[PDB]
Prior knowledge:
Helix 1 crosses helix 2. About 35% of the residues are buried. The radius of gyration is 14 Å and the shape is globular. The protein has a 3-stranded antiparallel β-sheet with strand order 1-2-3. The protein starts with a helix and ends in a 15-residue tail after the last helix. The chain contains 4 helices and 3 strands; from the N terminus they run ααβββαα. It has a single domain, classed as Lysozyme (Orthogonal Bundle). The protein is mainly alpha-helical. The chain binds chloride ion (5 copies), sodium ion and rhodium(III) ion (6 copies). It is an enzyme of class 3 (hydrolase). Lysozymes have primarily a bacteriolytic function; those in tissues and body fluids are associated with the monocyte-macrophage system and enhance the activity of immunoagents. Has bacteriolytic activity against M.luteus. This is Lysozyme C. Pfam families: Lys.
Amino acid sequence: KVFGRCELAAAMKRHGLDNYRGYSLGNWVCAAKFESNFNTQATNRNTDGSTDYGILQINSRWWCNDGRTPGSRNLCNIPCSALLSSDITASVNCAKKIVSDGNGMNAWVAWRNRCKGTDVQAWIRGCRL
Length: 129
Ligand SMILES: [Cl-]
Ligand SMILES: [Cl-]
Ligand SMILES: [Cl-]
Ligand SMILES: [Cl-]
Ligand SMILES: [Cl-]
Ligand code: NA
Ligand SMILES: [Rh+3]
Ligand SMILES: [Rh+3]
Ligand SMILES: [Rh+3]
Ligand SMILES: [Rh+3]
Ligand SMILES: [Rh+3]
Ligand SMILES: [Rh+3]
């Protein structure tokens, strides 16, 4: 599913991401934009052989099992395919664990490079939230 910007903002809010670990909703929407272009089916292979899955491009190296990432962990206790669902529950729940890991949203390199420090509120402008 390719979400609309405000549609995704609303789903993220309902699932408790607005101000989660201090990160306003626009931070999450901006991260999703640059990670996946709001596409829940997005996948991308990393150089180390791991793969990033879903709207927030969660990595199989640590967070989910895809059966093909040697030596990796599955800290969200989910198949990586769960992260590709039209329903964002699994991605949100796992994102909450990631952002709590010590590094905050710096865990998402696209957030650090493209969202951090910018006017992220723009990403939720106009939405009925
Ligand atoms: Cl957009
Ligand atoms: Cl915001
Ligand atoms: Cl594996
Ligand atoms: Cl599994
Ligand atoms: Cl933080
Ligand atoms: Na894994
Ligand atoms: Rh808010
Ligand atoms: Rh708020
Ligand atoms: Rh890499
Ligand atoms: Rh649901
Ligand atoms: Rh839902
Ligand atoms: Rh502004």
